[PDB]
Design an enzyme around this catalytic site. Structure first.
Site, PDB file in Angstrom:
ATOM      1  N   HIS A 265       0.858  -1.165   0.000  1.00 55.50           N
ATOM      2  CA  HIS A 265       0.000   0.000   0.000  1.00 55.50           C
ATOM      3  C   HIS A 265       0.901   1.223   0.000  1.00 55.50           C
ATOM      4  O   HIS A 265       2.118   1.120   0.138  1.00 55.50           O
ATOM      5  CB  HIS A 265      -0.899   0.020   1.242  1.00 55.50           C
ATOM      6  CG  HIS A 265      -0.120   0.040   2.510  1.00 55.50           C
ATOM      7  ND1 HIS A 265       0.324  -1.107   3.131  1.00 55.50           N
ATOM      8  CD2 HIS A 265       0.361   1.077   3.232  1.00 55.50           C
ATOM      9  CE1 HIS A 265       1.054  -0.772   4.183  1.00 55.50           C
ATOM     10  NE2 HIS A 265       1.096   0.547   4.263  1.00 55.50           N
TER      11      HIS A 265
ATOM     12  N   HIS B  78       1.213   5.599   1.320  1.00 56.90           N
ATOM     13  CA  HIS B  78       0.791   6.762   2.076  1.00 56.90           C
ATOM     14  C   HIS B  78       1.147   7.967   1.220  1.00 56.90           C
ATOM     15  O   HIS B  78       2.203   7.978   0.591  1.00 56.90           O
ATOM     16  CB  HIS B  78       1.505   6.847   3.429  1.00 56.90           C
ATOM     17  CG  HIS B  78       1.394   5.599   4.242  1.00 56.90           C
ATOM     18  ND1 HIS B  78       0.492   5.476   5.275  1.00 56.90           N
ATOM     19  CD2 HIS B  78       2.043   4.412   4.161  1.00 56.90           C
ATOM     20  CE1 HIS B  78       0.601   4.258   5.805  1.00 56.90           C
ATOM     21  NE2 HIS B  78       1.521   3.584   5.134  1.00 56.90           N
TER      22      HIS B  78
ATOM     23  N   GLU C 115       5.976   8.931   5.144  1.00 53.57           N
ATOM     24  CA  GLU C 115       6.006   8.673   6.578  1.00 53.57           C
ATOM     25  C   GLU C 115       7.419   8.826   7.117  1.00 53.57           C
ATOM     26  O   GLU C 115       7.679   9.692   7.950  1.00 53.57           O
ATOM     27  CB  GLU C 115       5.430   7.280   6.853  1.00 53.57           C
ATOM     28  CG  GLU C 115       3.988   7.186   6.409  1.00 53.57           C
ATOM     29  CD  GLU C 115       3.205   6.204   7.212  1.00 53.57           C
ATOM     30  OE1 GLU C 115       3.575   5.008   7.254  1.00 53.57           O
ATOM     31  OE2 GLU C 115       2.192   6.622   7.801  1.00 53.57           O
TER      32      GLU C 115
ATOM     33  N   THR D 172       2.878   1.567  11.276  1.00 53.64           N
ATOM     34  CA  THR D 172       2.624   3.005  11.322  1.00 53.64           C
ATOM     35  C   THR D 172       1.154   3.340  11.420  1.00 53.64           C
ATOM     36  O   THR D 172       0.822   4.525  11.441  1.00 53.64           O
ATOM     37  CB  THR D 172       3.232   3.715  10.110  1.00 53.64           C
ATOM     38  OG1 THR D 172       2.479   3.345   8.958  1.00 53.64           O
ATOM     39  CG2 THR D 172       4.724   3.399   9.963  1.00 53.64           C
TER      40      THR D 172
END
Ligand SMILES: NCCCN(CCc1ccccc1)CC(=O)N(CCc1ccc(S(N)(=O)=O)cc1)Cc1ccc(F)cc1
Ligand SMILES: [Zn+2]
Length: 257
Positions: A91, A93, A103, A195
């Site tokens: 995936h 972010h 991140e 996270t």
């Protein structure tokens, strides 16, 4: 429920997940001058030739491309790792604008996005058992900057219209994650955590130094996804990143001089 808004975002997570204030939380800032070259680290072994993607899912906080992890088909080994880690999902972010979204940061620099290829240690048998162990997971993190298009990302981008809202999924077979890797496998590594909640301290992080380039049009399509479910007020899925957490008593090691 936790999320990324003003009232349920990262600064609130500790109330339901007290490990949010723990000793090995992720992400972190990678201070490139303080990370020490470790000549004992081995080259990473990324063996994705037999990867079997199955499905893509909007889970309300990102989208996951899921793999068949019932056999050793796509595995990560070597580097800082002992043993064999199976790819379960990847995936990303990303941000509302190109100047934020990652991140991890590098000397406080934020990239436009960050890809996480999530793997679990097969010695623990299943992912749910692995997340209970300090060496249960290995997440390969790859930064995205905006420039030229990444051809190997386009098949992901073009299916996102079909999973706009939370809970939607789509068949996503025959996707080759090798098309998302940069040329170099030089990396930084440190012990950390998931996270997102439950923020479990079970991850060996391996963050590649070389970012991949994606086009503005590619990341703009990420930003058209929705955090909300169908038929709910539209909340664009943007800024689904946790900021850097205190490094505490940890050393970041570099695989390269
Ligand atoms: N619809 C998705 C809803 C959000 N979340 C629900 C989990 C949860 C459980 C308890 C309490 C709260 C939340 C995702 C989920 O379920 N995951 C993914 C875990 C994960 C992998 C990689 C990273 S990352 N960014 O690469 O560091 C972060 C997190 C599977 C799992 C499987 C078994 C477990 F025991 C724990 C997690
Ligand atoms: Zn992630």
């Amino acid at each position: 429920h936790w999320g990324y808004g003003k009232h349920n975002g990262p600064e609130h997570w500790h109330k339901d997940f007290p490990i949010a204030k723990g000793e090995r939380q992720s992400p972190v800032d990678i201070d490139t001058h303080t990370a020490k070259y470790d000549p004992s680290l081995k080259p990473l072994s990324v063996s994705y030739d037999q990867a079997t993607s199955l499905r893509i899912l909007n889970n309300g906080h990102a989208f996951n491309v899921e793999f068949d992890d019932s056999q050793d088909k796509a595995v990560l080994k070597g580097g800082p790792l002992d043993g064999t880690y199976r790819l379960i999902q990847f995936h990303f972010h990303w941000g509302s604008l190109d100047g934020q979204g990652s991140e991890h940061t590098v000397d406080k620099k934020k990239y436009a996005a960050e890809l996480h290829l999530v793997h679990w240690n097969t010695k623990y048998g299943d992912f749910g058992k692995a997340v209970q162990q300090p060496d249960g997971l290995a997440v390969l993190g790859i930064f995205l900057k905006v420039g030229s298009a990444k051809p190997g990302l386009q098949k992901v981008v073009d299916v996102l219209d079909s999973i706009k809202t939370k809970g939607k999924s789509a068949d996503f077979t025959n996707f080759d994650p090798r098309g998302l890797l940069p040329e170099s496998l030089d990396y930084w590594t440190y012990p950390g955590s998931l996270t997102t909640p439950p923020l479990l301290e079970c991850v060996t992080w391996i963050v590649l130094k070389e970012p991949i380039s994606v086009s503005s049009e590619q990341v703009l399509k990420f930003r058209k996804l929705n955090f909300n479910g169908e038929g709910e007020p539209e909340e664009l899925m943007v800024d689904n990143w946790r900021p850097a957490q205190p490094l505490k008593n940890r050393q970041i090691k570099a695989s390269f001089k």
